[PDB]
Each structure stands twice: as structure tokens, then as C-alpha cells.
Amino acid sequence: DMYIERAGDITWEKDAEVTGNSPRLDVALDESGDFSLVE
């Protein structure tokens, strides 16, 4: 039995930590909603 609990507002925050790269990938999406890498 699942339940929900509030965690915060949805707002852009100035001075948020900036990280993560921006890869360009060839992918395939199957009928089950799973993504896979195409090489």
C-alpha cells in the first residue's frame, strides 16, 4: 500500500550546485519502456 509525503516546492534555485556532463547517445526504446544503447 503506497502513500505520498510532501518533500518541497518546485522552484528554480539560484546558486544551486552545477554538475554533470552532456553526452550525445544513440538509444533504442522497447515496448516495455526500457532504453538500451545502440552501438
Partner: protein
């Protein structure tokens, strides 16, 4: 139950103790999450029940109480924020420049940020605070790092 707009944890008591299985967005009286988080089950909000209204396993999305309301899209140029809600931890904004998933049916933005599975459903936002998609359906690349699609529904 609680119908205030915002980001929410999705919890279960079926496993050991109380476990966070995902995250979602309450907007315009509709709860939005990824299909793999709830599997389409009903949800509780205090003494209230939220019933599924729309869902699609291939898009990996589900809405409760009404139709999918989130229609903003990544502009393809600008940095975005993941409003990450990890299990047991405070909501935290992370700014990043998305990468791209290229498919046979078009290109989608993607966010290369590493969080536990129970963070699925956390929203990705533009500079106006609009939700451009949900984090948590993606792939593992040639180093072990996680890359999530920016998954967005269609507002009918």
C-alpha cells in the same frame, strides 16, 4: 489528503520498514510519476485515495486524479535543474546542461546525474520553474554512470 502543488515522495510499507520507491509532482490537482514507481497501483494521501487516470508503460508515465498536466519542454540549449528527492534525504536542486538521446523517432534531452533508484519521478525544471520532464528512466553507459531521459508526457 494533501493536494498542495509540489514534489512528493512515494512510499511503501510492503518491504522492510517504510521504503521510498520513487517521487512525483502534484500540479493542478493531478499527481504525476513514472509508471515503474507505482506499477499503476492506487495511492494514499493521508486519509484520501488517489486513483490512476492515465498511464503508458512505453512512455513510463502515469497520472492520478486527472489527465497529464505537464507540458513544458526543454528548449534544447539551456541548463536545467533536477529537483532531486533521494530516499531519506532533503530535496536538493542540481543544475546541469542536458545531453541528448538520439532515437529512430526523434531526439530527447538526457541528464547525466547519479541518484538511487528511489529518486525516480524527481522533476527536471526550466528557468521559469516549469516541469519539463521526470528523471528516472534511462541507461548505464561505458563507465557505469547513469544517464536519464528527460521524460515528458502530452497534455491533451
Amino acid at each position: 489528503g494533501e493536494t498542495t502543488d509540489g514534489v512528493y515522495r512515494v512510499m511503501t510499507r510492503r518491504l522492510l520498514g517504510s521504503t521510498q520507491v520513487g517521487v512525483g509532482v502534484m500540479q493542478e490537482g493531478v499527481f504525476h510519476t513514472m509508471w515503474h514507481v507505482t506499477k499503476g497501483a492506487a495511492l494514499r494521501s493521508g486519509e484520501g485515495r488517489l486513483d490512476p487516470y492515465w498511464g503508458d508503460v512505453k512512455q513510463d508515465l502515469v497520472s492520478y486524479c486527472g489527465p497529464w498536466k505537464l507540458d513544458a519542454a526543454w528548449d534544447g540549449l539551456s541548463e536545467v535543474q533536477l529537483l532531486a528527492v533521494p530516499p531519506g534525504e532533503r530535496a536538493k536542486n542540481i543544475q546541469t546542461l542536458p545531453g541528448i538521446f538520439k532515437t529512430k523517432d526523434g531526439d530527447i534531452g538526457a541528464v547525466a546525474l547519479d541518484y538511487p533508484a528511489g529518486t525516480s519521478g524527481s522533476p527536471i525544471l526550466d528557468k521559469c520553474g516549469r516541469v519539463i520532464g521526470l528523471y528516472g528512466n534511462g541507461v548505464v553507459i561505458k563507465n557505469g554512470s547513469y544517464v536519464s531521459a528527460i521524460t515528458q508526457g502530452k497534455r491533451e
